Amino acid sequence: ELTPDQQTLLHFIMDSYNKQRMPQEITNKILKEEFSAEENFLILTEMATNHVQVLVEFTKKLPGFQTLDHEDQIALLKGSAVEAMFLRSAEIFNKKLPSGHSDLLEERIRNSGISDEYITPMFSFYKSIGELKMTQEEYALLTAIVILSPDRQYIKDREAVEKLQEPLLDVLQKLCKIHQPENPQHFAELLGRLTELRTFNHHHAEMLMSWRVNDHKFTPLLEEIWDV
Template identity: 30%
Template structure:
């Protein structure tokens, strides 16, 4: 029986089944065979990994061992390989039992059982489902249908808005955002001619519902109309969803008040041009400067632009966009919500559907591996954007009270 140093220290915990584990009381454990650091009870005795492996191999090979000296060798950590006969005798003397050694077949069965248990306890990171059920498929189809019916992607029906007077002249003389590209808001043909003709001038605009003498708010009426138009689409979107219609009227109102701006931001992202950093709303385009002219401040606008760039670069499918809208809509912690658990349960189902969609409908890649986590991060970030946007709106109204009745209703929850 020749020593095999490369196997001497091997660890195969599966072969020490049935011997029990040592209680961890903080005290160092010593191998009773050689004095090395012990790892627990193996084959009924406290031993190190080396002696455990040695005992198993010696018994399984059933070889006759003899001591070249007087069968009285001292076995310790440094010389335990010098006399295997005395080492085996020491193992038996401390109570190691050969009947506790498992057969090769039993070892393989145990290893397979351990592996199966580990797989059950440790699912793939980030994705907890591997199938896209028929119920989830129908949900995505219904959400897509609701989205397509309520989102005017080309803004062809955005018509009855207040026109913008004097904006281009102001921008040509006052530009505080030179690092952002400038674009003009192109009004529909009939409105633009009305504004250009002498019959509709800057003087005429002073008679409207806003104070145009404050050039800083030239875009405020138009942006208010634009946001109101988007919110109307969001309300229609929610009303088409069965899960939403099943809620009480009070909860429906609370969810819409709390999430409308978040859903608008998601929809605006679908028309956001990352390269030009503008929102392409059909024949109208809006830039960083336009929002400044509506009264928004740069400390809010820069994170807003960053968010839109971050979300747009995920290259989401329309299905993922609509599921993101649904996740934002169904948030049980909105102010005024009563059926929190019901709403949270619906939101969880939407989240599981999003995970299943990503796993089954996207090609496996490093980029897609963490897509669900990135989308959920964006959903969380939307809450911050919503709160900051509401503060901006309320601040603007304190200085320049101009808004639509719908906007006042939506933001009433934040002004209470």
């Protein structure tokens, strides 16, 4: 039941989503490098820096994004990056990875200077995502919805963000219905994951301050996108 309009929108989204890659030079380290809180931190920093670049590119290609005011573009990226990265991590942790990558990446994140107070909820959210059995189209669209959120701090023209978001929600709603007609509230449940992504924003500012007081340093890109 997608309309041709919706099909065009979906195709633009998936083309942009599918370019999302983490280089082998980074992911090889999961297995190859030593295991210390220090090296685990460096690995994660390398992953985060790469993923922020990937996300900036995805965001630039979202429908209408280019037509938004330049400062509002920046406010959307800053406001949504953490949530997009949690959702991407949820996708990664419920996906088949090369041999050994899932288990050892989990061990490294659990011994990277992140308190158990934030580890536990993080892996709990990854589990709730796994249980939804999301398709690639659901991940892509939900990510795009997170990025084009009108409530982020410092967005001036909220109304125009809100308009770009609307047809993504429409497509996502028809898709959920078509794919999981036996869980007719699957769309609502995805929106409920949006609410829960908001908690990871708070958790993340705290993780960053803990990392900083244990004298970990971030790349220049990360310092910008997350306000140091």
